[PDB]
Design an enzyme around this catalytic site. Structure first.
Site, mmCIF file in Angstrom:
data_model
loop_
_atom_site.group_PDB
_atom_site.id
_atom_site.type_symbol
_atom_site.label_atom_id
_atom_site.label_comp_id
_atom_site.label_asym_id
_atom_site.label_seq_id
_atom_site.Cartn_x
_atom_site.Cartn_y
_atom_site.Cartn_z
ATOM 1 N N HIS B 30 -11.934 -3.511 -9.854
ATOM 2 C CA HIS B 30 -13.377 -3.267 -9.869
ATOM 3 C C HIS B 30 -13.895 -2.440 -8.682
ATOM 4 O O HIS B 30 -15.051 -2.007 -8.712
ATOM 5 C CB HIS B 30 -14.184 -4.555 -10.090
ATOM 6 N N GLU B 54 -7.605 -7.224 -13.056
ATOM 7 C CA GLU B 54 -8.127 -6.865 -11.744
ATOM 8 C C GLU B 54 -7.078 -6.333 -10.782
ATOM 9 O O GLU B 54 -7.395 -6.056 -9.631
ATOM 10 C CB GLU B 54 -8.862 -8.054 -11.117
ATOM 11 N N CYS B 128 -13.481 -7.069 -1.345
ATOM 12 C CA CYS B 128 -12.547 -6.998 -2.461
ATOM 13 C C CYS B 128 -11.503 -5.910 -2.253
ATOM 14 O O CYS B 128 -11.820 -4.832 -1.747
ATOM 15 C CB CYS B 128 -13.288 -6.819 -3.777
#
Ligand SMILES: [Cl-]
Ligand SMILES: [Cl-]
Ligand SMILES: [Cl-]
Ligand SMILES: [Cl-]
Lengths: 170, 170
Positions: B30, B54, B128
């Site tokens: 993402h 992911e 992230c």
């Protein structure tokens, strides 16, 4: 080389291959059996098969060797690195051979261009696929698979992963 | 974690990624920038891009970090393993966070099924892509990339490579 490292060396096709991890197996392209629908019981469609010249890698969907840690696979090694070629024979004999590695290049061998690294022994055709390893600290690194040897005079070649870089010829 | 290990953690898109080797970079799907024709100056067609949920991996044709050794990337780690999440902030601050890892599973997160491993902190959205690492002997292993955190109460999730096995749920 410790027993567990030897345990990664695996009879395959007309030669050998090597478990890099529970799911990743490397071998020499010319030893890969022809006309089959599976490797190690796994259908081909369940495997990511990457082949470049004489270097073949399989990534299985199933954990094939869950007993193993992953280890590092590199594209060859620096000039002058002393490696060990972890040769198993059909009889079960272990024959680790010391080799001082030379240049990474695309070399014509038996009519084909082979991306690999040559070295000088410090082999038999059935040995193809045996890993070239060297120790880094307390761990071992694999950097090629046995692909060729001269008729005499102590030269060998391992196939290495595809990849261009400033230390290789090309 | 030593400086060289931190040096692998790299600003990327809306988050971070991690150099596993000179040519292999992993990150969280993402955070990967949209609508671009290159990553790190390399055209997309020169990159092998593997994405599963992911977890995103790039294998570049060019040696991008020839200073680095390869290191081991595994699919998560055993229940109870203490990892470190190597968080860099935009300011340059390092914030290594200790986490005790839990189950590997496919988990619904913000409407999507994510193959990953949850853990308990012993984060911010911009984190992230940060790697989850743990030390094995004298070396370090990477086993996931930061993907999610609970609003409170100290749960995090790293995305892990695709793969089914007897220790994971599914
Ligand atoms: Cl030894
Ligand atoms: Cl395992
Ligand atoms: Cl430490
Ligand atoms: Cl290098």
């Amino acid at each position: 080389a410790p027993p567990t490292l030897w345990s990664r060396v695996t009879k395959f096709g007309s030669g050998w291959g090597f478990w890099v991890s529970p799911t990743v197996f490397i071998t020499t392209t010319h030893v890969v059996p022809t006309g089959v629908k599976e490797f190690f019981g796994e259908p081909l469609s369940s495997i990511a098969i990457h082949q470049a010249g004489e270097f073949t890698q399989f990534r299985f969907s199933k954990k094939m060797r869950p007993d193993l840690t992953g280890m590092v696979l590199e594209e060859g090694c620096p000039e002058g690195t002393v490696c060990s070629v972890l040769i198993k024979r059909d009889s079960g004999e272990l024959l680790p051979l010391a080799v001082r590695m030379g240049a990474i290049a695309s070399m014509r061998i038996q009519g084909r261009l082979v991306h690999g690294q040559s070295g000088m022994l410090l082999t038999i055709p059935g040995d193809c696929g045996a890993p070239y390893v060297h120790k880094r600290g307390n761990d071992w690194v694999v950097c090629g698979v046995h692909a060729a040897a001269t008729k005499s005079g102590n030269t060998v070649v391992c196939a290495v992963q595809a990849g261009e870089g400033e230390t290789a010829l090309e």
